[PDB]
Amino acid sequence: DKDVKYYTLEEIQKHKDSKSTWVILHHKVYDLTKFLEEHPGGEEVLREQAGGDATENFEDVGHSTDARELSKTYIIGELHPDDRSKIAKPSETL
């Protein structure tokens, strides 16, 4: 409600251990901890790209033109602008 919650890619990569699961959908960190079983599909399918690159594995699924907007109420941030100043050249590395 103020701020970008710019989360570093290190931070997000921890979030798949037990409960806390975040999933990234076009330079946006979506928190889906309270959307695992609540997701109409299963649970583990979100976890398949927890703490990283869920983009390609989400837009491709082509959800709808109503539900993908709903994700915005679950945006907890986006890629930290240091690292994301570097997407420009992926050369990611590393």
Curated annotation (Swiss-Prot):
Example GO molecular function? electron transfer activity
Q: List UniProt keywords, sorted A-Z.
A: Acetylation, Electron transport, Endoplasmic reticulum, Heme, Iron, Membrane, Metal-binding, Microsome, Transmembrane, Transmembrane helix, Transport
- Tell me where it mainly resides: endoplasmic reticulum
GO CC terms, sorted: endoplasmic reticulum; endoplasmic reticulum membrane; intracellular membrane-bounded organelle; membrane
The chain residues annotated with the modification N6-acetyllysine are 2, 5, 14
Q: Where in the cell is it found?
A: Endoplasmic reticulum membrane; Microsome membrane
Write the protein's name. Answer: Cytochrome b5
**Native species:** Rattus norvegicus (Rat)
How is it placed in the membrane, per its record? Single-pass membrane protein
Gene label: Cyb5a
| Residue intervals of the Cytochrome b5 heme-binding domain | 4-80
Annotated GO biological processes are: response to cadmium ion
First and last residue of the signal peptide: none
Binding of heme occurs at 39, 63
Q: What does this protein do?
A: Cytochrome b5 is a membrane-bound hemoprotein functioning as an electron carrier for several membrane-bound oxygenases.
